Amino acid sequence: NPPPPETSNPNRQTNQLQYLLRVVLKTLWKHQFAWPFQQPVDAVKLNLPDYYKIIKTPMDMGTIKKRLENNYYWNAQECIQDFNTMFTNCYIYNKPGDDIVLMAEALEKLFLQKINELPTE
């Protein structure tokens, strides 16, 4: 595998960012379908031939959770895009009828529901 993505930013929208960690991520983390997305993809263990040749911006909730905890993000938009990157990576690598895709979509729908609760900008 390549190394996992960075969790620290080498350099106030903090309400939404706090909520992204405490409610959004935690709610997805606890969902039944969370396991494939709780850590960087280990393409050997999970036997995902060519995953890192196809997916150039790998992303996972383990990474996003640490970025939230390290106060890594520029802004809440940047975090929201890591979530979307994770989902869309799954839609790019896998066939649209696969279990893994159905799992991502369900998490994505839940994510959109929780994003609707975000505190104001």
Ligand X SMILES: CCCCc1c(C)nc2nc(SCc3nc4c(c(=O)[nH]c(=O)n4CCCC)n3CC)nn2c1C
Q: Where along the sequence are the contacts to ligand X (CB under 6 A)?
A: 35-37, 39, 41-42, 45-46, 48, 90, 93-94, 100
CA distance 105 to 48: 20
Q: Least distance to ligand X from the beta carbon of 10, Å?
A: 27
**R_g of the chain computed on alpha carbons:** 14
> Which CB atom, from 13 or from 39, has the smaller least distance to ligand X?
39
Q: Least distance to ligand X from the beta carbon of 88, Å?
A: 11
> Which CB atom, from 12 or from 45, has the smaller least distance to ligand X?
45
Closest-CA residue to 108 (of 76, 83, 78, 89)? 83
Q: Least distance to ligand X from the beta carbon of 11, Å?
A: 30
Alpha helices, DSSP H, located in 12-75: 14-19, 26-30, 51-54, 61-70
